[PDB]
């Protein structure tokens, strides 16, 4: 469901 | 789901049993001869404590109705500790006392509502009698004495607190921090404090104090509500690097966005904490700016057409330390330039001139006081990391105690103030006999604290209570030395505010329970 | 699945028990000496309330048949609160009374249908007697008095409501919002309100009021039904950026599409809310346009050959605030140009001229009234965010009460209006003895509210009821002061509409239950 | 899996119990003094209804054998409602009556087969006696009266139906739709109706009527069976855009393909509904073409070498509205050019000339009648969306009632026609005593409806039944006014067809159960 | 088991 | 079953 | 000895059940198409009778409260036969009827005393109407 | 375990 930015931030 | 519904007497006995488990567990710790309570842990060695608050936190009952009873007094009792930094245990035993007798009167067929009116009338009378008994604590000499007594006879702490209040006023912001090593330090820096706590626990990184503590954090000031945490990404990534924590001060941070913050800071990537902006309406936009100037940050408002995605580290404010509470936020040592800060103060002071109202005037003064007043920082002495942390604790408590004493004075502790105050209301009457019973129920309850303290000492409550009531003024029973005398001279006292809050909060939940006729909870299935 | 089917008497006792749990739980809160009900929570401290509606919401029984009983009266009783903003609890205790006696008569072998006819005849008579007893509330002086009484004696609120109604008429749209800080503000802006609620809860972001509240939202007007949420994507993405909420006003938003909106707005990405277009047929296409002109938006209809995929933010309307109800939508401060809005009004006014019918004429007048009338906005005063939110609540309630009082007047509260009205129908008769019993069942029930109020006070219902019945007019029993006198003069009253709806709705579900012979529910397996 | 097998008497009592739960639950609603049945819901408030059909749908028993009993009569009883638009409840109580006594005779040792022969003989006699009692309804005056009575005394509805039948004949297609607002509208448009229902529920988007309703749908005519839904993709994608629903009319749509359609239309992407092509053999290929010409579409047959993948929107037919039933499909307002349609009619009319057979002739006439006759569209009046939907319902029912009355006339309702008809067969005899018992069982059962209606009124069945039997013609008991007189004059009647179907269908399932010796069902494990 | 077309049609 | 747009919109 | 004391509704339903067994047993013999009742004997062959009085004599219930119900109507009903040489069975079914409905009214919340006054008033009226209907002999 | 051809044929 969630995604991850290159820097590791987990978010919707 | 399907509920289990209980009524009248069945509902009442359940509640009584619930608070009996709570109060009985907590009151064993009351007084200088208080007993130890052993609290189990999922992993490790049990906790051995005499801290009534710690015990209360652990109480949860299997029977849903009995549990509701415990959670209720457990809840308002804690309101006391929040209001005066002490008194939950007292509030708890006071609640058990009022509820126990109050419920008896009800089962005897007396009117619940009249019983409540009587309890309340007696409490109001008692609080006035309490103010009368109260001794002021206005000069630094007194401030120091109280602080010393609170710090367990450590004149050092007393001195520190007195010096700190002398620097920023007895209504000024004061914080305590670990020292640089041996010898205390008192400094006043650019800082501020507003009434807004963390937007959710989890942010809490200091469970002992249930507080959020950030070091050298950036501060994002956003005059809007945050829903889509996407807006943040560009800024959060920036804060991610630089490896500094971030304090979000927005109009509000909604569910999902907040969730994201908690999860991510909990994974090590970016440390964040959010709290609502102080105040509401127009005085909100103003205060948001004060913080900006104070921390050298730039407010990001949609009105002017600014966007969060386009916000850089340079827009963020900065401070050496921020501390977030269950309902308080304090910024310590803001980077804002003194030129800008001091200039800002000037602008607000003219506002006070052009002020065409008293209200508008009072609100403007509050703001300058914050911005101009600064923050007193007490850095606890040392000599070994252990002693340093232990002293820091005594200082923190002594501080809360002194703050309360400065607001409303002190009265004879050891529970004698309450019993003394009640001994004077022997003729207080209501409108009918039920109300009279309510009054007697409350007055009788006011003896619970002293009696319990005496019981813990292994003495006879009836006798000590009887003797203390026989005298007057602040004549009481020193549970420590187990000798009678003047409670204040013997240095056994409580801030009038803590005794007052304990009683009022106890009387509150007790009154509510006595007038409860139906309880609803989920089926144990 | 396999069902469990119950009949006649077995079915009836089950329902009776179900409503007894409901009514018994709720009625303890009735009156100024109402008791507290404790409602448990999955996480946190129990809720202590005297709000009958809150209690009712929590009631669900384990026995499926008994549960159906509770859910039925629970349902129509709520219809009362919806119709007059009050009376559910009353309706609930009234229903328990009618059902209890009505079922006794049935078990005694009396004809259910005749019993119901009698109850109904008595109710019709009672409603007329109620109108007679009713005191008008037509001038602002009265409007203010009522509002003040509703706001708990706050003349300020009474004044505000009176000023607001004076601005837009007593049948005009009035909304309340948090103020900018201290001192109220009354403004009339371009706005409108139609009878269409949210297309599903979940959109609700203000559970306290069970309402949807959007700030500075865009407004999509689509004269079609939306199935494939794909059509939306291009527009939603646009609304995604800009970070503004979106109100969807379509002919309808179907299941899957609606599901998507709920999910996504719940994840922070794009805040949406949808409601059906007002009216039906041709007057629908017209009204859809009015909203467009009012909000400066463009209606997107397939007829002209427009597509949603090709819709840009510029096609969307705009307003400062929209509030959606269980069955109402109100747009506040539309962006539409006054030139376009006022010109639109002109066009409709000629329509009224060229009108070759009274109906078509009435419909056109309704539209201009909306478009031309605007919306009165009350911004509640302040001095601390807490007091501000608390006053806003009292104003909102006082508003509903005043609105109802303006429609049908007021009558003696404290349950005396009902008992007074019944005392006059002592000779009302039906076509047979069963019907006569029905009449007596209803008249007897009309005493339930007063009797319950008196019981909560710890007094004797039989005596107070006996005394109130002995007098006449609005002579009643003030449960607060526990003294008799004129209920209206003592300022204890209910909007005639609330008492009427409570009675009619109670009588309705009671009549249905008394005439129920079979119940079907799933097997507990 | 392992089965549980029951025999003779054990099997029979189980069935009896099952239908007793069904019939007993349903018959409480019978008649003007019918009682309410409360049907539970998984989410929301229970349903309170007096609709025997609604109750029947909810009946499912825990005991597998008892359940089979209920499901059997439940099944054929519904066949009645399908055949005459009414009578399921009647059929159900008639079935309980025949079965109850028939089984008693069996247990007494009488021959099941002879018992069945007797019941059947009595039923045949009864249906003839029913035709004799029947009053014609051939002129518009009568058509209107019946419709009015069906619409609950709304002369408007009666008038509408009469006008509609006058336009397209009393055997012509007539549909009802929501109106454009206040005032009805009657229009005859190009349309058609064939005997083919939806290829599966799920397509149903109007559960209240258990019907599929598409607006402005495309129509794909494929003279083949569809297995691989891939063939469709190119076309479905086309229909996907354009945002219009699609009606698939193929030789058949197989499992997987059908599954795909349901799923996808249920996800919002493309709305589809499929039904088999009308008729079979050669008259199928012809009729498929008629629909094509009528809707301006192109038939896609493999014979000519056409492929579905190469089918574009231009090949698809088109209509303003299509309505699909459990076993009927009606196309409303086809786009086909009047030039092509009318020309097509010409071709079929020559076929009738060159017709060398009566059958081939009757089939051709049927086709032109459909193509040339069109469809009468009644648009229900209005004034509020609620009343409009409620009137639309009464019209729809009144229509079914009138249609049936036009086919076989009317007879005295309130259950008197059946009891009257039976009173005349007092001398009917069979070949042996068992058969005679069967006859008496049936005749006795024919009294069930009236008796039940009287019981619901709280009167004595034996007496009313006795009195109605005493008279003759259409002399009966008006349950509403509870007075005797001529049932037809009092306007209490049922279409002879509904009474006939109810009886024959009841007699059918009853005969089957009475001659059942073994039951097989899965083990409750 | 099933696939999805660009326009979202779920199928075998 | 569902898909996600670049901006994060979850849909069929 | 220790007693078992029952009140109001509980007491009433017991009595009702008791007279129901009595009346139901006896009334089957009433009329020219009366049915047979079989009364068992300690020694010998059962007694087959259509004599309501014989049946009444044999009725004794296990439940003490239900039994008191039966014994009471059984007692005053016999007073009838003593006074006119006939009518016990009739008195018994009449008692079951009045009691059955009378008790329903009571459970419905009606005043027992007023119910009794009404029954009595109706009976007095009925007896007069009966004298009028009477043919001399 | 199994694979799918472009035309949808499921196979080992």
Domains in chain C: boundaries: 1-134+410-524, 135-190+372-409, 191-371
First to last CA, chain B: 10
Closest-CA residue to B418 (of B502, B514, B478, B488): B502
Take residue D240 and report the two structure tokens written for it.
Answer: 């996907």
From CA G107, how far away is CA G16, in angstroms rounded? Answer: 12
Closest-CA residue to B506 (of B436, B440, B449): B449
In chain F, what's the furthest Cα-to-Cα distance?
A: 18
Q: Which residue has the tokens 């004429």?
A: C361
Closest-CA residue to B215 (of B302, B331, B132): B331
From CA C287, how far away is CA E1, in angstroms rounded? Answer: 48
Closest-CA residue to B179 (of B396, B384, B388, B379): B379
Q: SS3 of B209, please?
A: coil
G32 is in an annotated binding site: yes
| Surface of C (322-361) touching B: CB under 8 A | none
Which of C102, C108, C110, C441 is the best substitution to test chain G (most G C-beta atoms within 10 A)? C108
Closest-CA residue to C216 (of C296, C307, C334): C334
E&F contacts, CB < 8 Å: 3
D479 close to D453: Cβ distance less than 8 angstroms: yes
From CA B348, how far away is CA B282, in angstroms rounded? Answer: 14
Q: What angle do CA B73, B78, B84 make, to 5 degrees?
A: 135
Question: Which string of DSSP letters, residue by residue, matches C122-184?
Answer: HHHHHHHHHHHHPBP--SHHHHHHHHHHHTTS-HHHHHHHHHHHHHH-TTS-EEEEE-SSSS-
| Binding region of B | 29-32, 50, 86-90, 414, 478-480, 494
Take residue G65 and report the two structure tokens written for it.
Answer: 């409260």
Closest residue, chain E, to C229 (C-alpha): E8
Take residue C110 and report the two structure tokens written for it.
Answer: 């009396």
| Binding region of D for ATP | 29-32, 50, 86-90, 414, 478-480, 494
Half-sphere exposure of D95 toward its Cβ, with a 13 Å CA cutoff?
40
- Helix C88-107 and helix C496-514: axis angle, to 10°? 30
From CA C30, how far away is CA D380, in angstroms rounded? Answer: 47
Looking at residue C482, what DSSP letter applies?
A: T
Per CB-CB distance under 8 Å, the chain E contacts of C257 are: none
SS (H, E, C) G33-100: CCCCEEECCCCCCCEEECCHHHHHHHCCCCCHHHHHHHHHHHHHHHHHHHHHCCCHHHHHHHHHHHHH
G56 close to G77: Cβ distance less than 8 angstroms: yes
Closest residue, chain F, to C240 (C-alpha): F7
Whether A10 and chain F come into contact, CB under 8 Å, resolves to no
Q: Are strands B272-276 and B300-301 parallel, antiparallel or unpaired?
A: unpaired
**Cβ within 8 Å of residue B339, ≥6 positions away:** none
From CA C114, how far away is CA C439, in angstroms rounded? Answer: 10
From CA D336, how far away is CA D313, in angstroms rounded? Answer: 15
From CA D93, how far away is CA D103, in angstroms rounded? Answer: 15
B424 close to B470: Cβ distance less than 8 angstroms: no
From CA B479, how far away is CA B33, in angstroms rounded? Answer: 8
| Surface of G (88-117) touching C: CB under 8 A | 104-105, 107-109
Sign of CA dihedral C126, C131, C132, C133: positive
SS (H, E, C) C370-412: HHHHCEEEEEECCCCHHHHHHHHHHHHHHHHHHHHHHHHCEEE
Dihedral Cα D240, D241, D245, D246, nearest 10 deg = -60
Experimental method: X-ray
Q: Does domain C135-190+372-409 have CATH number 3.30.260.10?
A: yes
Interchain pair B269, A9: CB under 8 A: yes
F5 close to C233: Cβ distance less than 8 angstroms: yes
From CA B419, how far away is CA C305, in angstroms rounded? Answer: 85
Helix ranges (H only) for C169-308 are: 233-240, 255-265, 282-295
Closest residue, chain D, to C518 (C-alpha): D37
Q: Do chains A and B touch (3 or more CB pairs under 8 A)?
A: yes
Tell me the nearest-neighbour CA distance from F3 into chain C, angstroms.
11
Neighbouring chains of G at 3+ CB pairs within 8 Å? C
Interchain pair B256, C271: CB under 8 A: no
If residue B22 lies in a helix (H) or strand (E), which one and from where to where?
Answer: helix B8-27
Which of A7, A9, A12 is the best substitution to test chain B (most B C-beta atoms within 10 A)? A9
| Number of residues written out for chain C | 525
Q: Which residue has the tokens 């009047």?
A: D338
Cβ-count burial of D139 within 10 angstroms (0-12 exposed, 13-18 middle, 19+ buried)?
A: exposed
List, comma-separated, the residues after which chain B is broken, a break being a C to N distance over 2.5 A; otherwise answer none. Answer: none
From CA D210, how far away is CA D398, in angstroms rounded? Answer: 18
How many whole angstroms from its chain centre is CA C72?
A: 17
CB atoms within 10 A of CB B113: 21
Closest residue, chain E, to D235 (C-alpha): E9
First to last CA, chain D: 10
How many whole angstroms from its chain centre is CA C225?
A: 28
Interchain pair H10, E3: CB under 8 A: no
From CA C499, how far away is CA B228, in angstroms rounded? Answer: 46
B499 close to B88: Cβ distance less than 8 angstroms: no
From CA D200, how far away is CA D202, in angstroms rounded? Answer: 6
Per CB-CB distance under 8 Å, the chain F contacts of C270 are: 9
Closest residue, chain F, to A11 (C-alpha): F8
Take residue G24 and report the two structure tokens written for it.
Answer: 């139901």
Closest-CA residue to C450 (of C483, C481, C478): C478
Q: Which residue has the tokens 């009976």?
A: G123
Per CB-CB distance under 8 Å, the chain H contacts of E3 are: 4, 8
Per CB-CB distance under 8 Å, the chain F contacts of D267 are: 12
From CA C283, how far away is CA C348, in angstroms rounded? Answer: 12
Q: What is the Cα gyration radius of chain B?
A: 26
From CA C69, how far away is CA D38, in angstroms rounded? Answer: 10
**Cβ within 8 Å of residue C342, ≥6 positions away:** none
Sign of CA dihedral B459, B460, B465, B471: negative
Q: SS3 of D28, please?
A: helix
From CA B340, how far away is CA B351, in angstroms rounded? Answer: 17
**Cβ within 8 Å of residue G62, ≥6 positions away:** none
Q: Where are the beta strands (DSSP E) in D116-271?
A: 173-178, 185-189, 191-194, 212-215, 218-226, 246-253
Q: Which of B240, B256, B263 sits opposite A10 (nearest CB)?
A: B263
From CA C191, how far away is CA B172, in angstroms rounded? Answer: 48
User: Which residues of chain F approach chain D closer than 8 Å at the C-beta?
Assistant: 12
Looking at residue C297, what DSSP letter applies?
A: -
- CATH superfamily for B1-134+410-524 is GroEL-like equatorial domain (1.10.560.10)
Q: Do chains C and B touch (3 or more CB pairs under 8 A)?
A: yes
Per CB-CB distance under 8 Å, the chain B contacts of C59 are: 3, 5, 520
Q: Which of D36, D178, D243 sits opposite C512 (nearest CB)?
A: D36
From CA B502, how far away is CA B90, in angstroms rounded? Answer: 6
C250 close to C292: Cβ distance less than 8 angstroms: no
The CA distances from residue B82 to B494, B498, C45, C278, D446, in Å, are: 15, 10, 16, 51, 81
| Number of residues written out for chain E | 12
From CA B519, how far away is CA D395, in angstroms rounded? Answer: 51
From CA H3, how far away is CA B24, in angstroms rounded? Answer: 69
Tell me the nearest-neighbour CA distance from F11 into chain D, angstroms.
10
Q: Which residues pair with B191 in a beta bridge?
A: B332
Whether H6 and chain E come into contact, CB under 8 Å, resolves to no
Question: Which string of DSSP letters, residue by residue, matches B331-361?
Answer: EEEE-S-HHHHHHHHHHHHHHHHS--SHHHH
Which of B258, B261, B264, B270 is the best substitution to test chain A (most A C-beta atoms within 10 A)? B264
From CA D49, how far away is CA C387, in angstroms rounded? Answer: 48
Q: Which residue has the tokens 């009292």?
A: C394
Closest-CA residue to C217 (of C311, C375, C380, C335): C335
Q: SS3 of C430, please?
A: coil
From CA D323, how far away is CA D215, in angstroms rounded? Answer: 9
Q: What is the Cα gyration radius of chain H?
A: 6
Domain B191-371 is in which class?
A: alpha beta
Dihedral Cα B439, B441, B443, B448, nearest 10 deg = -160
From CA D494, how far away is CA D408, in angstroms rounded? Answer: 11
Q: What angle do CA D61, D64, D66 make, to 5 degrees?
A: 60
Task: Write phi, then psi, for D16 (nearest 5 degrees).
Answer: -55, -50
D272 close to E11: Cβ distance less than 8 angstroms: no
Q: Are strands B191-194 and B300-301 parallel, antiparallel or unpaired?
A: unpaired
Half-sphere exposure of B508 toward its Cβ, with a 13 Å CA cutoff?
17
Take residue C498 and report the two structure tokens written for it.
Answer: 């609330």
Å resolution of this model? 3.0
From CA G15, how far away is CA D339, in angstroms rounded? Answer: 89
From CA D415, how far away is CA D27, in angstroms rounded? Answer: 13
Take residue D50 and report the two structure tokens written for it.
Answer: 């007096």
Interchain pair A12, B240: CB under 8 A: no
User: Which residues of chain E approach chain D closer than 8 Å at the C-beta?
Assistant: 5, 7-12
Looking at residue D398, what DSSP letter applies?
A: H
Per CB-CB distance under 8 Å, the chain C contacts of G104 are: 107-109
From CA D259, how far away is CA D199, in angstroms rounded? Answer: 11
From CA D307, how far away is CA B265, in angstroms rounded? Answer: 59
From CA B88, how far away is CA B30, in angstroms rounded? Answer: 11
Tell me the nearest-neighbour CA distance from C101 into chain G, angstroms.
8
The set of long-range contacts for B100-105, using a CB threshold of 8 Å and a minimum separation of 24, is B100/B16, B100/B20, B101/B441, B101/B444, B101/B445, B102/B438, B102/B441, B102/B510, B102/B513, B102/B514, B103/B12, B103/B13, B103/B16, B103/B513, B103/B514, B105/B434, B105/B437, B105/B438, B105/B441
Q: What is the Cα gyration radius of chain F?
A: 6
A&B contacts, CB < 8 Å: 29
Tell me the nearest-neighbour CA distance from C97 into chain G, angstroms.
14
Per CB-CB distance under 8 Å, the chain B contacts of C48 are: 72, 512, 516
Q: Do chains H and B touch (3 or more CB pairs under 8 A)?
A: no
Take residue G77 and report the two structure tokens written for it.
Answer: 């009903």
Looking at residue C315, what DSSP letter applies?
A: G
Neighbouring chains of D at 3+ CB pairs within 8 Å? C, E, F
If residue C222 lies in a helix (H) or strand (E), which one and from where to where?
Answer: strand C218-226
Take residue B149 and report the two structure tokens written for it.
Answer: 């007594």
Cβ-count burial of D457 within 10 angstroms (0-12 exposed, 13-18 middle, 19+ buried)?
A: buried
From CA F11, how far away is CA D225, in angstroms rounded? Answer: 33
Q: Which residue has the tokens 């509408």?
A: D160
B523 close to B72: Cβ distance less than 8 angstroms: no
Sign of CA dihedral D126, D128, D134, D139: positive
From CA B403, how far away is CA B409, in angstroms rounded? Answer: 10
The set of long-range contacts for B486-492, using a CB threshold of 8 Å and a minimum separation of 24, is B487/B412, B487/B413, B487/B414, B487/B416, B487/B417, B488/B135, B488/B410, B488/B412, B491/B149, B492/B412, B492/B413, B492/B414
Interchain pair C229, D21: CB under 8 A: no
Looking at residue D512, what DSSP letter applies?
A: H
Closest-CA residue to B413 (of B486, B341, B482): B486
Q: Which residue has the tokens 């409860």?
A: B516
Q: SS3 of B28, please?
A: coil
If residue C342 lies in a helix (H) or strand (E), which one and from where to where?
Answer: helix C338-353
Q: What is the Cα gyration radius of chain E?
A: 6
Q: Which residue has the tokens 């009442």?
A: B12
Take residue B123 and report the two structure tokens written for it.
Answer: 């409490």
Same fold, C135-190+372-409 and C191-371: no
D89 close to D23: Cβ distance less than 8 angstroms: no
Cβ-count burial of B79 within 10 angstroms (0-12 exposed, 13-18 middle, 19+ buried)?
A: middle
D187 close to D377: Cβ distance less than 8 angstroms: yes
G31 is in an annotated binding site: yes
Closest-CA residue to D241 (of E9, F11, C272): E9
């Amino acid at each position: 469901s969630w995604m991850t930015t290159p820097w590791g931030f987990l978010h919707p | 789901a399907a509920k289990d519904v209980k009524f009248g007497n069945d509902a009442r006995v359940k509640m009584l049993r619930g608070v009996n488990v709570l109060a009985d567990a907590v009151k064993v710790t009351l007084g200088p001869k208080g007993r130890n309570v052993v609290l189990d842990k999922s992993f490790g060695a049990p906790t051995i404590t005499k801290d009534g608050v710690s015990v209360a936190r652990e109480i949860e009952l299997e029977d849903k109705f009995e549990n509701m009873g415990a959670q209720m007094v457990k809840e308002v009792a804690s309101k006391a500790n929040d209001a005066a930094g002490d008194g939950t245990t007292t509030a708890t035993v006071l609640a058990q006392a009022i509820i126990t007798e109050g419920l008896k009167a009800v089962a005897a067929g007396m009117n619940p509502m009249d019983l409540k009116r009587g309890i309340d009338k007696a409490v109001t009378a008692a609080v006035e009698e309490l103010k009368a008994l109260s001794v002021p604590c206005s000069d630094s000499k007194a401030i120091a004495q109280v602080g010393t007594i609170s710090a367990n006879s450590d004149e050092t702490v007393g001195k520190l607190i007195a010096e700190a209040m002398d620097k920023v006023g007895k209504e000024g912001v004061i914080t305590v921090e670990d020292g640089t090593g041996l010898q205390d330090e008192l400094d006043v820096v650019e800082g501020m404090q507003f009434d807004r706590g963390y937007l959710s626990p989890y942010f809490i990184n200091k469970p002992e104090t249930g507080a959020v503590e950030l070091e050298s954090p950036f501060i994002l000031l956003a005059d809007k509500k945050i829903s889509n945490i996407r807006e943040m990404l560009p800024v959060l990534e920036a804060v991610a690097k630089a490896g500094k924590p971030l304090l979000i001060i927005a109009e509000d941070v909604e569910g999902e966005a907040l969730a994201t913050l908690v999860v991510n800071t909990m994974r090590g990537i970016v440390k964040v904490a959010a709290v609502k902006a102080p105040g509401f309406g127009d005085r909100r936009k103003a205060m948001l700016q004060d913080i900006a100037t104070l921390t050298g940050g730039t407010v990001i408002s949609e009105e002017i057409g600014m966007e969060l995605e386009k916000a850089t580290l340079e827009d963020l404010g900065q401070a050496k330390r921020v501390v977030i509470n269950k309902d308080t936020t304090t910024i310590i040592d803001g980077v804002g330039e003194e030129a800008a800060i001091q200039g800002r103060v000037a602008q607000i002071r003219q506002q006070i001139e052009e002020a065409t109202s008293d209200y508008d005037r009072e609100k403007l003064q509050e703001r300058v006081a914050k911005l101009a007043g600064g923050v007193a920082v007490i850095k606890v002495g040392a000599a070994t990391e252990v002693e340093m942390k232990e002293k820091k604790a005594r200082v923190e408590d002594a501080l809360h105690a002194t703050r309360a004493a400065v607001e409303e004075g002190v009265v004879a502790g050891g529970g004698v103030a309450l019993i003394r105050v009640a001994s004077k209301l022997a003729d207080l009457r209501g409108q009918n006999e039920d109300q009279n019973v309510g009054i007697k129920v409350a007055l009788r309850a006011m003896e619970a604290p002293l009696r319990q303290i005496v019981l813990n000492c292994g003495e006879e409550p009836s006798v000590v209570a009887n003797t203390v009531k026989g005298g007057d003024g602040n004549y009481g029973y020193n549970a420590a030395t187990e000798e009678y005398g003047n409670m204040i001279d013997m240095g056994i006292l409580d801030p009038t505010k803590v005794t007052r809050s304990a009683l009022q909060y106890a009387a509150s939940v007790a009154g509510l329970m006595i007038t409860t006729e139906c309880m609803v909870t989920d089926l144990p299935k």
